[PDB]
């Protein structure tokens, strides 16, 4: 048995040597030359009130105007970002929701949490009222992130250390992704829908193949649990957030620690990470009751977003990049631009 | 400025907001409770007793007061990242069986560690903890069969039921690092039908009284 451990250690050492070999220069050296981005000023254009409980997750629709927010009050609310009107208020069977997402087609919306069930809701029912289409149960751990791969298939991350791709009509997990030493929390979809990356408490980020059903790449370097992860707009890189108060950017091709964002006066963890449309601005939520803008290239604090009285749990940038939403445990959603 | 049915959409938004506010007001009066403990600590038997794969919710109605009990024992996953969602729980019911010394993989040390972890958790500083010690009826003779020294080496009192239970509950209470912020209730429930309900009602009403005094300025 010890031979297997020795082989694994040798393989890890070879991987590390390969990582070091291609580290000719650090991103800071190349990015020092570009002009710095000036202080980015943003204001609370809209304060989407209406929730009476904590906010954990949100998602922007492909139309870049409608968004859905999940709260522990037991209601999923679809908001009109321009008029703030309440499009829908879906009564959840289980109030302990932890994540939600909006279908790219806009005809579906899903959420889940401690109930261990991925509920799929129809937003264009002939009946008129939103109803659950199919309860995609089967996970043995609390759901932590759900993203719609396509209008008829989704990918789910749960606390049972497994990520499963669910077929809507069939009601079964067609593909199962395993290999995480700890519970997997966050998950992001690549722009091409070909790859997705997830992070777990094992302080490692895993890249998986959508159709091959096998692991592709693994990343390490975080000193604590991973909480947030999102793809770079080009899709060839992604930034990951951890409870160690540091945000790190990894490139799939480079396959090594590219750049780490951190400040001395920041000690809280990171709950949500998102990228701007151009990718120059990195937006990450922090538990100190405000969000800080990080320059994706120069790693400088380009700005600070504040106004929430509690931890910011979710944030997302519209597909057009016009505005970025922020959600916190105080039951308030703020749109910035 | 609004169009013909933009006003209609605004009216629908107001209707949805009114319905959501009514539902939230209705739910606020309802009491929320969290049930923690080992699987073999009589959680299922006890929850079934007082009834009037993921998280399980139960509803009770006692003396015109609504209850919400949350069972998360079946959730076999790492804590400290999903427990924080229960920050609003009025009180935590911590069920421990007095008869679990004889099993070693020792459950008493695990239960003490769990109590230390949740009671001292930063998210539950102001919450009240109710200790329902079950399996008293068979503990009555289990204590006779084996002494508490099998699990508590520092124990030196008489090997009596009344003294053994007192020492056990004192030890459980001692784990609380903050005496003033929170109070830990202790009760022996199993083998009874209404006393457990009465104790839960007393604990919840005491918590409400404390909250009223605190927001009145007396705490």
């Amino acid at each position, epitope marked *: 048995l010890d031979q297997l451990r020795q082989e694994a250690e040798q393989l890890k050492n070879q991987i590390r040597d390969a990582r070091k070999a291609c580290a000719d220069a650090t991103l800071s050296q190349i990015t020092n030359n570009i002009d710095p981005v000036g202080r980015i000023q943003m204001r609370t254009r809209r304060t989407l009130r209406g929730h009476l409980a904590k906010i954990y997750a949100m998602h922007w629709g492909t139309d870049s105007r409608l968004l859905v927010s999940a709260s522990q009050d037991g209601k999923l609310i679809i908001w009109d970002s321009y008029t703030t*009107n309440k499009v829908h208020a879906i009564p959840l069977r289980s109030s302990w929701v932890m994540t939600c997402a909006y279908a790219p087609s806009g005809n579906y919306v899903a959420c889940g949490g401690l109930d261990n069930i991925c509920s799929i809701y129809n937003l264009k029912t002939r*009946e*008129g*009222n939103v109803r659950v289409s199919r309860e995609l149960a089967g996970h043995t751990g609390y759901l932590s992130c759900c993203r719609f791969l396509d209008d008829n298939q989704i990918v789910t991350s749960s606390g049972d250390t497994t990520c499963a791709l669910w077929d809507i009509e069939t009601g079964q997990q067609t593909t199962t992704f395993t290999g995480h030493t700890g519970d997997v929390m966050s998950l992001s979809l690549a722009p091409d829908t070909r790859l997705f990356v997830s992070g777990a408490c094992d302080a490692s980020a895993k890249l998986w193949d959508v159709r091959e059903g096998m692991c592709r790449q693994t990343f390490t370097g975080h000193e604590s649990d991973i909480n947030a992860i999102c793809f770079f707009p080009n899709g060839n890189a992604f930034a990951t957030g951890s409870d160690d108060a540091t945000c790190r950017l990894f490139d799939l091709r480079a396959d090594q620690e590219l750049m780490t964002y951190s400040h001395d006066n920041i000690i809280c963890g990171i709950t949500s990470v998102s990228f701007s449309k151009s990718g120059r601005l990195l937006l990450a939520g922090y538990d100190d009751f405000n969000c800080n803008v990080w320059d994706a290239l120069k790693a400088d604090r380009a700005g600070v977003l504040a106004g929430h009285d509690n931890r910011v749990s979710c944030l997302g940038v519209t597909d057009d990049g016009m505005a970025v939403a922020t959600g916190s445990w105080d039951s308030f959603l703020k749109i910035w631009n | 400025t609004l*169009s*013909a049915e*933009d006003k*209609a959409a605004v*009216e*629908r938004s107001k209707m949805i907001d009114r319905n959501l506010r009514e539902d939230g007001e209705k739910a606020a009066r309802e009491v929320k409770l969290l049930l923690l403990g080992a699987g073999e600590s009589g959680k299922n038997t006890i929850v079934k007793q007082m009834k009037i794969t993921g998280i399980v919710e139960t509803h009770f109605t006692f003396k015109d007061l609504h209850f919400k009990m949350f069972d998360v024992g079946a959730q076999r996953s790492e804590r400290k990242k999903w427990i924080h969602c229960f920050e609003g729980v009025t009180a935590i019911i911590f069920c421990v069986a007095l008869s679990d010394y004889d099993l070693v993989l020792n459950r008493m040390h695990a239960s003490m560690k769990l109590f230390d972890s949740i009671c001292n958790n930063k998210w539950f500083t102001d919450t009240s903890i109710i200790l329902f010690l079950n399996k008293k009826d068979l503990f009555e003779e289990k204590i006779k069969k084996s002494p508490l020294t099998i699990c508590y080496p520092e124990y030196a009192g008489s090997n009596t039921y009344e003294e053994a239970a007192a020492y056990i509950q004192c030890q459980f209470e001692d784990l609380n690092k903050r005496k003033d912020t929170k109070e830990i209730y202790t009760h022996f429930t199993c083998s009874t039908d209404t006393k457990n309900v009465q104790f839960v009602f007393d604990a919840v009403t005491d918590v409400i009284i404390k909250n009223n005094l605190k927001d009145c300025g007396l705490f």
Partner: single-chain antibody
Amino acid sequence: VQLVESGGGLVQPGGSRKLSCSASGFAFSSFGMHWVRQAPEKGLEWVAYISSGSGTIYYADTVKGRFTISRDDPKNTLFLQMTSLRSEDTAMYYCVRSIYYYGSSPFDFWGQGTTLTVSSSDIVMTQATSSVPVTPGESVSISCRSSKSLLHSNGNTYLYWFLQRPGQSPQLLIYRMSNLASGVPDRFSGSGSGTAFTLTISRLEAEDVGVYYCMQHLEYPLTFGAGTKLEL
């Protein structure tokens, strides 16, 4: 989805009646209702509108006061108490289903209708031709014009197109002048500009024969065009 309305018959001039519309198969408690009437040989005409939960109610200038609209969500029924009738009120009455929100399809469903015969600033809709011959496999363009531009400052053009097969209830074809209604064959395609609009049909075939109704929903009272009857 089904809408059943009844309460027709012969009414002497100056009489009263109580029409009803039964709602089933949909969340009537949250959906608004409209009443649109069609004369025995003329086009449609808006009657009344009741919002969700009876929050807001509107009536046409030619029917204000004469009729009152009420609904009972627990009974899933819509009521239209009517009195002081005259010969001008003799017309088919249609129960209309509508929900108002972004991406919604108002006026997407229409009831069968009830026959009620009486014993013997508003926007004006204009249509190019009353009837135009058609042939299967061809394309026909129908043009509709409004007194004022229907493009609101928000960027949405408020045009609704309805088709009524001979003897059947009308159905919604194009809403907002750019989006296809649910369940349509997809042959239709709407386009237009400020005060000018047109409806294009690709590969006209059977079951498309009927009268096309032009509607505006920028400001009440709602008005309807004279209709354009396609004939084979």
